[PDB]
PDB file of C-alpha atoms and ligand atoms in Angstrom:
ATOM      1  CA  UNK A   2     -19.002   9.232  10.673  1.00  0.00           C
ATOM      2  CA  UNK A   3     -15.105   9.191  10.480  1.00  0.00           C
ATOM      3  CA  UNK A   4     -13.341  11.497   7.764  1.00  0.00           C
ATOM      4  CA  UNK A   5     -11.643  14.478   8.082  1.00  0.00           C
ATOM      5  CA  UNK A   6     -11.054  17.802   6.160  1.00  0.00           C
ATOM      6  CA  UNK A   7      -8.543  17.741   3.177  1.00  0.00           C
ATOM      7  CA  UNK A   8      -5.586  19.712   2.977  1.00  0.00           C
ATOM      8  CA  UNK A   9      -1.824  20.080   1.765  1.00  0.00           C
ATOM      9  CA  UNK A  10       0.572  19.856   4.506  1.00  0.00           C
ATOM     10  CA  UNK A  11       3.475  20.259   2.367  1.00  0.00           C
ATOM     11  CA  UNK A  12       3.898  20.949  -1.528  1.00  0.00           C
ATOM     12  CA  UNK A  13       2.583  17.830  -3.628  1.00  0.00           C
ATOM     13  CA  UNK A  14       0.721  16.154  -0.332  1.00  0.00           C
ATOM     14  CA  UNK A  15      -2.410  15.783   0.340  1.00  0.00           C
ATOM     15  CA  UNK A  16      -4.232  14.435   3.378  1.00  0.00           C
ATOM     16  CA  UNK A  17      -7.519  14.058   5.593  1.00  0.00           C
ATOM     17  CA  UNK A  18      -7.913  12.098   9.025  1.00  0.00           C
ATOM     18  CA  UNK A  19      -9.891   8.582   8.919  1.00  0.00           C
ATOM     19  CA  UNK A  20     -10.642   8.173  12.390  1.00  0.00           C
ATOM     20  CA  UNK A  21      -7.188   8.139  13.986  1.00  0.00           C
ATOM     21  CA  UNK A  22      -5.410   7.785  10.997  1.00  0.00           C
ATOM     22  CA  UNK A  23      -3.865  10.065   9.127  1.00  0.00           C
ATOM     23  CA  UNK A  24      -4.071   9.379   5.003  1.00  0.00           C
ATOM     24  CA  UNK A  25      -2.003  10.935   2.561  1.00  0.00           C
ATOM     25  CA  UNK A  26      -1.511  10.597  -1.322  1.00  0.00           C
ATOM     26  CA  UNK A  27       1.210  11.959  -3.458  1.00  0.00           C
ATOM     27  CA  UNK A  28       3.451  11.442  -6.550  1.00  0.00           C
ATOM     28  CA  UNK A  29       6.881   9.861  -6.962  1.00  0.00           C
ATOM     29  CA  UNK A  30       9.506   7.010  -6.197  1.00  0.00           C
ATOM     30  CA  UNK A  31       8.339   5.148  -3.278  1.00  0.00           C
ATOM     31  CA  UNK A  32      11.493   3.200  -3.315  1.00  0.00           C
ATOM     32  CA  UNK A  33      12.878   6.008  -1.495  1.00  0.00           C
ATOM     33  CA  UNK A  34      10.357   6.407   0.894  1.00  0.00           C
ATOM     34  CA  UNK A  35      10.638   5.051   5.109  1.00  0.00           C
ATOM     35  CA  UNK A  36       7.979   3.415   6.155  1.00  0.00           C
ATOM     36  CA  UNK A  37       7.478   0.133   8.870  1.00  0.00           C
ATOM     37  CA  UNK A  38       6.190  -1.469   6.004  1.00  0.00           C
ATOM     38  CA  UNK A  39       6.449  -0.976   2.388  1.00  0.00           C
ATOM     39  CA  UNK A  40       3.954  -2.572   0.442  1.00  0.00           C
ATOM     40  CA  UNK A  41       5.006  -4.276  -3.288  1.00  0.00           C
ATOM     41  CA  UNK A  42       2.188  -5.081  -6.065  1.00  0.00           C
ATOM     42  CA  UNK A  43       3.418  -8.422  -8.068  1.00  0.00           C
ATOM     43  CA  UNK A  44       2.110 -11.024  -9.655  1.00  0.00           C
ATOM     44  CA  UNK A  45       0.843 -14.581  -8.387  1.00  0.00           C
ATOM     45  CA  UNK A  46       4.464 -15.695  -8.462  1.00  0.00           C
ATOM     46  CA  UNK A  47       5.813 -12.946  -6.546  1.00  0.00           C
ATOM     47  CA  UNK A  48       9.051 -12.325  -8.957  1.00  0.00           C
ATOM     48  CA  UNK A  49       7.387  -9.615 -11.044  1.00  0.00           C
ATOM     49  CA  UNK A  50       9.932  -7.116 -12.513  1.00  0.00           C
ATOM     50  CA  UNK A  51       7.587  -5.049 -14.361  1.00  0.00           C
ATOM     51  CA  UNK A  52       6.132  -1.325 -13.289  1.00  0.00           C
ATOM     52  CA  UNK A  53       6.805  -0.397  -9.982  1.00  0.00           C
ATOM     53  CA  UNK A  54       7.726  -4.077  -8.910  1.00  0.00           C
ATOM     54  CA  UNK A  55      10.745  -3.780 -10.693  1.00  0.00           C
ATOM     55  CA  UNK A  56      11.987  -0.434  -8.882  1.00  0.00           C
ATOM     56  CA  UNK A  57      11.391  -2.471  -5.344  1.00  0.00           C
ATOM     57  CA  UNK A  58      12.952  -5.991  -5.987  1.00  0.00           C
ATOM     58  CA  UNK A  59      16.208  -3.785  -7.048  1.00  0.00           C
ATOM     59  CA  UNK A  60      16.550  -1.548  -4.279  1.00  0.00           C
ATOM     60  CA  UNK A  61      15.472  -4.347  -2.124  1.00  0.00           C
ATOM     61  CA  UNK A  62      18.044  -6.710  -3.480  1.00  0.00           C
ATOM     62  CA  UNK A  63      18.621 -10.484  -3.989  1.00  0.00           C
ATOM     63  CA  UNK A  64      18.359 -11.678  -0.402  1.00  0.00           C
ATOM     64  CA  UNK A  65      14.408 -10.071  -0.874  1.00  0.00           C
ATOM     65  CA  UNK A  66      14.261 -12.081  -4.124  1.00  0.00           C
ATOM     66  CA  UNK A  67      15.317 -15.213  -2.684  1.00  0.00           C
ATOM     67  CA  UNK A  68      12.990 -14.939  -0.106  1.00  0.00           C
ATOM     68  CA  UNK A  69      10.214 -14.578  -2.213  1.00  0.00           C
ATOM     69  CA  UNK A  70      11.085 -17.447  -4.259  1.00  0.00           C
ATOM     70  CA  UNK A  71      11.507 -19.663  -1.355  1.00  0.00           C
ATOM     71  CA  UNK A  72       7.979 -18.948   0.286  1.00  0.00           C
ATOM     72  CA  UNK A  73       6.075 -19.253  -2.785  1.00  0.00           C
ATOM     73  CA  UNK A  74       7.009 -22.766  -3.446  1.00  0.00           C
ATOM     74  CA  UNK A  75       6.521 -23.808  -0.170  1.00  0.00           C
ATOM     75  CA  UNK A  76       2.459 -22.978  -0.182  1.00  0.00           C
ATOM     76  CA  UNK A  77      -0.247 -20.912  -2.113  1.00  0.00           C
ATOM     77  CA  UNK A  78       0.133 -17.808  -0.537  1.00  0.00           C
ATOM     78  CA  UNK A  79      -2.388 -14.692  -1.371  1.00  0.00           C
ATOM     79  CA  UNK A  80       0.586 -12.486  -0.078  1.00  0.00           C
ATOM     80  CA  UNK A  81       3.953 -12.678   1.740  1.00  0.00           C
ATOM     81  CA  UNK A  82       5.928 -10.690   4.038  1.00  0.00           C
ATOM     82  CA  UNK A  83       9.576 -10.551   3.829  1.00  0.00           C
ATOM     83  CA  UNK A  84      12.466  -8.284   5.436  1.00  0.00           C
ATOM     84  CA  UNK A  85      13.067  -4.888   3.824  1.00  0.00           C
ATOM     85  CA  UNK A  86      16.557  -5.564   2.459  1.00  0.00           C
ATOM     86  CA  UNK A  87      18.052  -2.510   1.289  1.00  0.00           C
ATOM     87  CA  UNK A  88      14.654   0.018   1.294  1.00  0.00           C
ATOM     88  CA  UNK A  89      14.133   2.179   4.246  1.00  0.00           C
ATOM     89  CA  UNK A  90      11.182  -0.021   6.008  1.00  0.00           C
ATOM     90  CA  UNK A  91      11.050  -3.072   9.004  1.00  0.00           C
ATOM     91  CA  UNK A  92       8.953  -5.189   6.341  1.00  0.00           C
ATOM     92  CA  UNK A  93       7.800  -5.633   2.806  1.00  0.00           C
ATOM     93  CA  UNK A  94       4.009  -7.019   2.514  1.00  0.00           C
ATOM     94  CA  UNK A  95       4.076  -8.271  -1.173  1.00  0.00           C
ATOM     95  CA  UNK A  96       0.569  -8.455  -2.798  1.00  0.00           C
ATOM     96  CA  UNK A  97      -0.843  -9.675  -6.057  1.00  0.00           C
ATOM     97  CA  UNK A  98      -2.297  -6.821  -8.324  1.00  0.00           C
ATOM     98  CA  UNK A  99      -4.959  -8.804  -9.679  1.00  0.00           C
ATOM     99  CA  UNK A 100      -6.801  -9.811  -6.548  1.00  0.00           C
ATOM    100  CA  UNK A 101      -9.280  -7.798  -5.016  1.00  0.00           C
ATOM    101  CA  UNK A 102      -7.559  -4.460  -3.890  1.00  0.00           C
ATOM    102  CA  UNK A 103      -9.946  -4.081  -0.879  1.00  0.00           C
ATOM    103  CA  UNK A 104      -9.203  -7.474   0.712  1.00  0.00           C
ATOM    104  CA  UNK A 105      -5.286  -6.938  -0.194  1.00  0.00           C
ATOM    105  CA  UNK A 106      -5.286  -3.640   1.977  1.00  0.00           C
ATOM    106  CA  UNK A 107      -7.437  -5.313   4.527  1.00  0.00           C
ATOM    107  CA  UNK A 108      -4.773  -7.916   4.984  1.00  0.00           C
ATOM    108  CA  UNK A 109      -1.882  -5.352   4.879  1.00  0.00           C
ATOM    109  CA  UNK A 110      -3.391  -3.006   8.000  1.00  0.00           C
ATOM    110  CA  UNK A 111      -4.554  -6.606  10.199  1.00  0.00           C
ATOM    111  CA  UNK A 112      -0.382  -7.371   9.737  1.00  0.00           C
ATOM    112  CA  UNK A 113       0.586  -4.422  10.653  1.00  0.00           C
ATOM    113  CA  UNK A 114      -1.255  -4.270  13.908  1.00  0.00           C
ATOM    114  CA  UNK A 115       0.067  -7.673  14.643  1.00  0.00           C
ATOM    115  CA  UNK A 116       3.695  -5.932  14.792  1.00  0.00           C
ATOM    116  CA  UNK A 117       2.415  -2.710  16.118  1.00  0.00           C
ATOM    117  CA  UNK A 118       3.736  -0.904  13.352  1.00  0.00           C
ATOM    118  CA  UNK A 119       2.772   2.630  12.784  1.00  0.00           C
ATOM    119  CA  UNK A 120       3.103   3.997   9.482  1.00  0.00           C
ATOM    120  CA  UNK A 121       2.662   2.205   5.255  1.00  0.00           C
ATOM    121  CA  UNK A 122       3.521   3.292   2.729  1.00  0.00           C
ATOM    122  CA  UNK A 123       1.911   1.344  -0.747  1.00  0.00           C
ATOM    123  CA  UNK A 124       1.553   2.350  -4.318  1.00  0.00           C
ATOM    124  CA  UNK A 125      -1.709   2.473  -6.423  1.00  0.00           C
ATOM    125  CA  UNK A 126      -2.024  -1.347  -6.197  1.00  0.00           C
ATOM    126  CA  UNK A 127      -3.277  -3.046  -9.287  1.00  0.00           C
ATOM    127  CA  UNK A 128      -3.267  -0.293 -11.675  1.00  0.00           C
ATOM    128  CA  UNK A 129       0.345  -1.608 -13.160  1.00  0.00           C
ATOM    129  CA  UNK A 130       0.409  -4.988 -15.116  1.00  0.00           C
ATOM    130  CA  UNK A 131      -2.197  -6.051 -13.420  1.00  0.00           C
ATOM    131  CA  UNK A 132      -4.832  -3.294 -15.644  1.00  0.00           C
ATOM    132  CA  UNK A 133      -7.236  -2.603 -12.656  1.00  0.00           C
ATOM    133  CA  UNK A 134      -9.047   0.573 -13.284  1.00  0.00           C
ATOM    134  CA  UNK A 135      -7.287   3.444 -11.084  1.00  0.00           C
ATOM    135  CA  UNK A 136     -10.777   5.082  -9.644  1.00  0.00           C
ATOM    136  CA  UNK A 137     -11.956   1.326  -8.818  1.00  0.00           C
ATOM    137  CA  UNK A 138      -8.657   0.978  -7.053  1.00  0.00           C
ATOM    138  CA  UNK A 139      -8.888   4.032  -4.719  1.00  0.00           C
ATOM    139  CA  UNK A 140     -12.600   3.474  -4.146  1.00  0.00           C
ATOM    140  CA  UNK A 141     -10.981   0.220  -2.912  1.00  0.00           C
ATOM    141  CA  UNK A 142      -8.057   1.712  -0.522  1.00  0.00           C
ATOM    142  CA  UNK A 143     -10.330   3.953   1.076  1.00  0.00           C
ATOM    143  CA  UNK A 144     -13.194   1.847   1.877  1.00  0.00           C
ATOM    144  CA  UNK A 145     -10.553  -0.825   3.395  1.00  0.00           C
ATOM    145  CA  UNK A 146      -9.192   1.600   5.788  1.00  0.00           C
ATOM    146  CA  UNK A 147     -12.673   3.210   6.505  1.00  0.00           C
ATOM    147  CA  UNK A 148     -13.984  -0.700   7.623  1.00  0.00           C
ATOM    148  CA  UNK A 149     -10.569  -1.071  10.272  1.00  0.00           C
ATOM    149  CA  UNK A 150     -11.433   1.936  11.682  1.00  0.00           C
ATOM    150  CA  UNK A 151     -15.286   1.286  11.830  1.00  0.00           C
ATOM    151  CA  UNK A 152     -14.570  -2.177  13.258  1.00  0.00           C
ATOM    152  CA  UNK A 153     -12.522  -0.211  16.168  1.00  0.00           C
ATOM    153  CA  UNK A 154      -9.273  -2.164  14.773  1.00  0.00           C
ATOM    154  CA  UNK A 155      -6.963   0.860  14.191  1.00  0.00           C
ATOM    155  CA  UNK A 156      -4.691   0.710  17.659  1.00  0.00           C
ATOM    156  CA  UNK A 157      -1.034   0.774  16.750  1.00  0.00           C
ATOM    157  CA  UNK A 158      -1.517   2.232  12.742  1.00  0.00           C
ATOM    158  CA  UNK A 159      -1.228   6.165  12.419  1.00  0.00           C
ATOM    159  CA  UNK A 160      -0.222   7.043   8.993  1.00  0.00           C
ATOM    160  CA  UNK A 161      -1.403   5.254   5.598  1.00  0.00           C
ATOM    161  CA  UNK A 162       0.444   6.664   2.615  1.00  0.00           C
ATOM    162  CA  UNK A 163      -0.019   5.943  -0.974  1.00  0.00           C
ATOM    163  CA  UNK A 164       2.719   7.207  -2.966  1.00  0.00           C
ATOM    164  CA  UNK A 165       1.940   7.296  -6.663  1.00  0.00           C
ATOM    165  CA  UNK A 166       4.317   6.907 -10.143  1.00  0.00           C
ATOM    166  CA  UNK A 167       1.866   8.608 -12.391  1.00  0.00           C
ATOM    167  CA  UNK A 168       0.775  12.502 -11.705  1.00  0.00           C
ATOM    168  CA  UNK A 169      -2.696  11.497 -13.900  1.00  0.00           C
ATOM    169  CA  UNK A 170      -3.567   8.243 -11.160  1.00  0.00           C
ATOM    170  CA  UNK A 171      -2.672  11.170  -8.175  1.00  0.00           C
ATOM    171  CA  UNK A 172      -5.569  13.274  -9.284  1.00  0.00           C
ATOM    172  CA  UNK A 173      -8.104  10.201  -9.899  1.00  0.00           C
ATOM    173  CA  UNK A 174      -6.961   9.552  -5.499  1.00  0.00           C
ATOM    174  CA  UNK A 175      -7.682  13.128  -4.665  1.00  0.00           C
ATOM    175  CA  UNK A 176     -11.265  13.671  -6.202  1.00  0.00           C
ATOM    176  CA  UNK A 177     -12.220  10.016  -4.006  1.00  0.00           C
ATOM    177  CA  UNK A 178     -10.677  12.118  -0.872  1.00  0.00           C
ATOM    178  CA  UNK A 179     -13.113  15.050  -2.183  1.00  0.00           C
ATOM    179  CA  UNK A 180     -15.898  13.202  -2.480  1.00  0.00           C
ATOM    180  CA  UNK A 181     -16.135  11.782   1.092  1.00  0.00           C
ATOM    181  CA  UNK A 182     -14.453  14.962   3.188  1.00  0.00           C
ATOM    182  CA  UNK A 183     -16.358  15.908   5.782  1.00  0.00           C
TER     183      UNK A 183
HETATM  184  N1  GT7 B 201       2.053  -0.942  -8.127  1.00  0.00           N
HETATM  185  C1  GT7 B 201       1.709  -0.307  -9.026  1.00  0.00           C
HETATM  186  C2  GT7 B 201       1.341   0.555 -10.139  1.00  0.00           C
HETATM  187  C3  GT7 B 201       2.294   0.400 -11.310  1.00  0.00           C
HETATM  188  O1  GT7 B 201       3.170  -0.483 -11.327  1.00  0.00           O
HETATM  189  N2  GT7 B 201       2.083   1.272 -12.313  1.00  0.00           N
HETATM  190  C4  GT7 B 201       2.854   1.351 -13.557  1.00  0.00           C
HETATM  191  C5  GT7 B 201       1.999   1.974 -14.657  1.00  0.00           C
HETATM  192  C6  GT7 B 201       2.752   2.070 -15.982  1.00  0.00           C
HETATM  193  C7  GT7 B 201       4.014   2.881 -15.816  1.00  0.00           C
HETATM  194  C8  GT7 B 201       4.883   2.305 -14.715  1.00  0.00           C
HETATM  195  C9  GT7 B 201       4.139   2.142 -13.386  1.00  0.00           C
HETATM  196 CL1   CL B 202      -0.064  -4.225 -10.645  1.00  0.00          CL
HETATM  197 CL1   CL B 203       1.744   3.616  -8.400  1.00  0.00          CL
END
């Protein structure tokens, strides 16, 4: 009902249309990657430094940090969005690995719209200290952006990227795009 073909539009990518969006995977540093939003998997307390949380708070800097700090104690938040500080994005969504990845992504897109942003860019959330499973995870991704599409939701997003540390969690993303191509 809505997926594409996949393909590799450049070396290491690898994409296939969900209804109007385009989704891509691929390895490397995403703290060099622009993006409206950049999405950050931490813990509950939103000062993780640990995996690829610890790459982001430092190229995002203290100012990021502090902000963190200062919205967590004001409520219980099951994520926050702060400024981008010194990465290449509008926004950082910060999310907590350990809850359920489908609802986290759902949250992340519904944002996004609300700023009629464009394009994210997120790692493979949950599969750092947080021990989810890595094909639970992208079974996860996939079905959230599948149901905002379905639900006729997707206006302003046009490009969901996951950009991945480990070459070994890429290949577990690309046999889910496999499995559902049209
Ligand atoms: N977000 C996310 C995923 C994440 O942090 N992954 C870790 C796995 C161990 C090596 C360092 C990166
Ligand atoms: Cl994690
Ligand atoms: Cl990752």
């Amino acid at each position: 009902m809505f997926y594409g073909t996949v393909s590799s539009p450049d070396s290491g990518v690898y994409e296939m249309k969900i209804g109007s969006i385009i989704f891509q995977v691929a390895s490397g540093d995403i703290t060099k990657e622009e993006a409206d939003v950049i999405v950050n998997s931490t813990s509950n307390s939103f000062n993780l430094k640990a995996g690829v949380s610890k790459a982001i708070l430092e190229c995002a800097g203290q100012n990021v940090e502090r902000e963190c700090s200062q919205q967590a104690q004001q409520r219980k938040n099951d994520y926050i969005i702060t400024g981008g500080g010194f990465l290449r994005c509008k926004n950082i969504i910060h999310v907590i690995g350990g809850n359920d990845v489908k609802s986290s992504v759902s949250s992340v897109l519904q944002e996004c719209e609300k700023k009629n942003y464009s394009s994210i860019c997120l790692p493979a959330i949950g599969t750092g200290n947080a021990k989810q499973h890595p094909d639970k995870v992208a079974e996860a991704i996939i079905d959230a952006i599948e149901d905002f599409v379905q639900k006729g939701s997707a206006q302003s997003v046009k490009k969901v990227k996951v950009v991945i540390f480990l070459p070994q969690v890429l290949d577990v993303f690309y046999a889910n795009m496999k499995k559902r191509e049209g």
